[PDB]
Paper text:
To explore the relationship between inhibitory sybodies and binders that potentiate channel activity, we have determined structures of LRRC8A in complex with the sybodies Sb4 and Sb5. In contrast to the three inhibitory sybodies, which target each subunit of the hexameric LRRC8A channel by binding to the convex face of the LRR domain, thereby stabilizing distinct conformations, the complexes with Sb4 and Sb5 display a high conformational heterogeneity where the LRR domains are poorly resolved in a majority of 3D classes. In both, LRRC8A/Sb4 and LRRC8A/Sb5 complexes, the sybodies bind to alternating subunits as their epitopes are only accessible in LRR domains located at the r-position of tightly interacting domain pairs whereas they are hidden in the dimer interface in the l-subunit. As in the LRRC8A/Sb3 complex, the conformational rearrangement of the LRR domains is coupled to the pore domain leading to the opening of intracellular subunit contacts, akin to conformational changes observed for the Sb3 complex, though this time at the loose interface. In contrast to the stabilizing effect of the inhibitory sybodies Sb1 and Sb3, the two potentiating sybodies Sb4 and Sb5 appear to increase the overall mobility of the LRR domains, which is reflected in the poor resolution of the respective region in both complex structures.
Members of the LRRC8 family form heteromeric assemblies, which function as volume-regulated anion channels. Here we address this question by generating synthetic nanobodies, termed sybodies, which target the LRR domain of the obligatory subunit LRRC8A. The five identified sybodies either inhibit or enhance activity by binding to distinct epitopes of the LRR domain, thereby altering channel conformations.
Author numbering:
A (entry chain D), B (entry chain C): 15 to 68, 92 to 176, 230 to 808
Write the structure that this text describes.
Amino acid sequence: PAYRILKPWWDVFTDYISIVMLMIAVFGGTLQVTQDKMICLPCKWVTKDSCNDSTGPTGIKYDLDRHQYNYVDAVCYENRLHWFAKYFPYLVLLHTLIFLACSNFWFKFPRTSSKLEHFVSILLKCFDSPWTTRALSETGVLDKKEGEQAKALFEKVKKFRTHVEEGDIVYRLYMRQTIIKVIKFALIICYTVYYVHNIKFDVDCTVDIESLTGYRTYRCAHPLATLFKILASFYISLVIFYGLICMYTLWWMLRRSLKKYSFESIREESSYSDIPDVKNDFAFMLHLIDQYDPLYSKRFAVFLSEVSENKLRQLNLNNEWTLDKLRQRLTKNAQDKLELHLFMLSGIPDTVFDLVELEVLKLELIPDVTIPPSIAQLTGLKELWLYHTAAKIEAPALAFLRENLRALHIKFTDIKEIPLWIYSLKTLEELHLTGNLSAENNRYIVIDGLRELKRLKVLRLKSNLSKLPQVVTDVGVHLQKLSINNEGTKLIVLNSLKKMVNLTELELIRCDLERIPHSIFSLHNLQEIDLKDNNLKTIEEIISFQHLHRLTCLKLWYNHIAYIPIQIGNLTNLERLYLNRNKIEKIPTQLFYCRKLRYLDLSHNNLTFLPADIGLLQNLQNLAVTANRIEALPPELFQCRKLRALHLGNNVLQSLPSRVGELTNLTQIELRGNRLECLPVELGECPLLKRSGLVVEEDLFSTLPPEVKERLWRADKE
Amino acid sequence: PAYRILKPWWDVFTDYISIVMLMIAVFGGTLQVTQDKMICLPCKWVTKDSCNDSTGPTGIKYDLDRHQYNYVDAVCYENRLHWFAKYFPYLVLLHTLIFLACSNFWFKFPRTSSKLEHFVSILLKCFDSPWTTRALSETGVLDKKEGEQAKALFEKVKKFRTHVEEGDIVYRLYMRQTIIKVIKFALIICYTVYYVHNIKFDVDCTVDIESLTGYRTYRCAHPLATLFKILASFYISLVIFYGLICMYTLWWMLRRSLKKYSFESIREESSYSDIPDVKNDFAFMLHLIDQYDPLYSKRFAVFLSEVSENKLRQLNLNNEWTLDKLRQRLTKNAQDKLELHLFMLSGIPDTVFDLVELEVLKLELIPDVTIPPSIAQLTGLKELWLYHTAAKIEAPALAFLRENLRALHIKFTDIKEIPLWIYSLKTLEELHLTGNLSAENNRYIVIDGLRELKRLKVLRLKSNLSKLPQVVTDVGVHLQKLSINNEGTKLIVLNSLKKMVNLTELELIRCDLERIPHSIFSLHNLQEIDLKDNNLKTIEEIISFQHLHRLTCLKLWYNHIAYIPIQIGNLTNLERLYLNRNKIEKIPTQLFYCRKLRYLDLSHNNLTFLPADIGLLQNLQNLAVTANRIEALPPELFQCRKLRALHLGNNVLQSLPSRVGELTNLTQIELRGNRLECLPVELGECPLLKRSGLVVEEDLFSTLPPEVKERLWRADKE
């Protein structure tokens, strides 16, 4: 009912031939059992154990009782009848039983029976699956249950292939059965043809029975001899057909090396070129099914293609993640735009394009993903993150992003991972590059197309570059903010900054320059400048910084600066100053000449004293002197009531002056890490400073007056 | 188990006839086995190997024992009884078995058994399909899974047809089987009719056994001979019927040329000419099923016709997208026009034309759309948007569109996918081209039909063109509005804009001119000019702007203009002029000669304070200096009474002048990102200012007195 698919035409023909042989055997057996008598008459004149056949004629008197005739018949039948005539039906019954056993040996051998049952069940599953139909049709949307069932079928197929690949028992067992059938046919043909001529109607008998009858020899007649001869010839012809069929099977087994399956036809005509050529013990069962019907093999092809696996994986992925689950996965980033981050997925779920509220999409380790056009449903998309994903795109989505995308982030370890189509994103304004780009004789080759980014305004370079790309210098004609992170690689300007005259922010982090380039000063449009981690020692180049009439903020944090040049007194244009984590030891008075200053951090330095001129900078809002050696505070500092916060931590401030409460606009303090005796009570008179804004160790905190404790706590509550 | 559907009436009759033949075969066989004795007597007077046939009568004494009679019977039965009388039933059994084997060969031959079971399975699937019931009843909405299974059935039918039309095995096998049946019938009837005469009741046997009985020849009676004779006559009659039926089947197979099926009645009973001529190995099963009955063939032919599949799949689409679902998804676009979006649909739902209330429709990513005449149902439709949707049009559809269309948007990724009929329309007022049509050596030829748009007035050409096509200038002799966006590509004018005398609103977006061409100056009737991000640096050409007498609006922002020339004040006609996002640092007093100016934007510029002359332009209502370096608000600006918006957010404003309450018409105020400590109270006396209208930080918003905040909240509430 189910294994009939596994029976080629030769097998079913041999089964029918065996059934016919069995019918012949049972008919001959019942015929011989019911009546197989001999009829014997004695030879009156006999020589050489055979009589010579020598008014009206009269009968011959033998003077024998009927029982004497019966006794002679029995004796001659048991003795002088050829054993072939006596035992032909049982012989053919035994031979056909052996043939049936040989046919069914591999079916009843559990070691290969389990493999055959698994093969047939899996082949039926692959034949009746709905996924293979659509896979062949394509050369979509489906239910959860059917998708997971199809996935289970795929993994069962892989397990079955692993199991049957190393077996190589079915092929040799089939060879053994075919050889056994062939040799049985050969011996049967030889001996049966040799002995068939030994059954005949006339037979002679000489049994040395005189004391019971008185005659020596008898001419016996075997009435069933001719019918048995006809049955024997019919059976011999049947065995000849059986042997011819078995020999054809043997030849079929030895003309194409059935151990190996070509598989080329369907793997090339269905465009699934990634279909393996099947190997031993698995090519053979596929050959058998081909002999039944190649359509089953064609259906089973799509479960080894290695590509249909990707298709099913992405389809089940699209099935699983629902828009509700994605919204629960939705997060708000630092820049306060609606964010969904995809990490370590085989592909992009299609339901992510159902969230019209999405603004920024991230792709972290997503292999072989091509952007579907359904991205058009995402109106708010402005930022796209490529965290180590080489992603392709099609024309409609490409145009949609060309007209809609504003920010792009590329994190890569290889240049080939960069999507070549990004250069058409003519509405792109901000791009972030992470990954080395220098190539042996092909460095700065991919980025030549950056001239196409006409609306580019922000660029992030993290590639350990030693010479700045010329194309960057060219495109900087409209750039407004440029950030580079060489991560320890020394960068040489080679006077390649005097063409990005539109730049308004220049950040050079970990570029290891050790000097301030002169082309910085030529950018009079600059406003904010940083020289992080370039091991700066002397910043006297600020002499040429007076050309920068609109330089507002300057950062020299995390450098090796030891002193503040007096020239900064001339550049009063500064509004934010960052100099922490340097080796600066003292504050010259000239620094206090920038009266419009609003931010000042001098943390992590060798500073020991605070000059009194700090009070001259009324607009200062925050102060940071963390990790310094200041022990006492000049009271003039407390004349800047508009100082919202101050960072005195990790210092050696012995005692806080009581004027601190005069700073009403103050809201935050840093006091942990300093050797203080008791907190001033006047500190608790600040209208806006709260326990949240009051940072200090608990031992100094408990010395606060109880009214101060209650006021700070109630400010924290509300 | 409806396998008999492939058995015609004659196959059934042959089966029954074979059953009867086998029945008489087993009857004759068991009769011959049980009793076939031939009773022989010697005759004393022999003439020519035969009995001469020559006081009361007395018997004849032959002097033979019973056993000698038995021996004579055996020998004469063996030798001189004609073999036909002995072996008639076995021959009948053999022939009946051969006939049954021929009849069931194709059922039991696995190669063709596979195709036959495949065909019967798919046919039984098709017969029970409600799709057939609905299609034949057509001569309303059901389950989606029903449409899906119908489409899957269509696909599997296509795949099977592709599989089986090339085989040509079942026909040749059936032909060979029926030929074998007929030739076997001929041979058997020949020999049986010839040899049935030897079934005689009495037979003379001359055997030459003298030494055993002493009689030369014997007369024998075969008692069963007459019964065998009538059995053989009956068998001959049955074989005659069987052979006549097989001859009829041969005639049926050799007159209709069964290799090709007709499928002709379909196009006259259901007007379905969507059915091919079925080739070999598939017409055969169709013919056989027809011989059963044609109802199955008819109810199966529908699944072959692709047009019926398309129409009922469209029915399924309508089942998914019902009219109420459409109106639920119905939206209004920004231009106050009822619009529905059809994004990534397989085909146009038919129900959409039940809603005449639509005037704008957008078709994006809907493959192979052919515009139906049912678009005539939508009278008020005026605008259609084509997004990557190559559309074929119909004559009623083209007629309706050439007289009931006002504006058209077509976007295309390739030249070949533009519909060619669009130029033929005459009522089209607005055409929107969005797609790179740049071609080499045959540029501006694909749109050579552009001159056929005689009612065109508004034209949007976003095609990344290097120079303006001459055909565009040809059509521009009568146009009104032209919008060009080259996406950063430089636009070449070269005396190709002075011919658009009737243009009313000119817009150049990222045309990369970098310098205003003189051509615009010849267009006196022009009203509004835009140069969005055309990399402009010098705008001296505004001196020639006095040629444009009615020029009231100017758009030059998103450019790199640093200094405003004075002579722009000579244009008193100006009404709205935004100049944000430029390098403007000081507004010349001459610019304030444009007394009729009403809307001004100066955001993202480098101003520090404002000239007094702005107070003299009372006609202004909207001012925008957002995100700038304006130190303080000059009070003279309060003299412009009808100001309803002041976009002053993100400035360096320190203290807001109290005269803000002087603006009664003041509606919207944005002040985020300003260094403002305290707010004036007059801000709460503005009748048209509301809490949403006033954009200010909530903690800073709490600086206002409680009455101010309460009044603003009450005004905003209703």
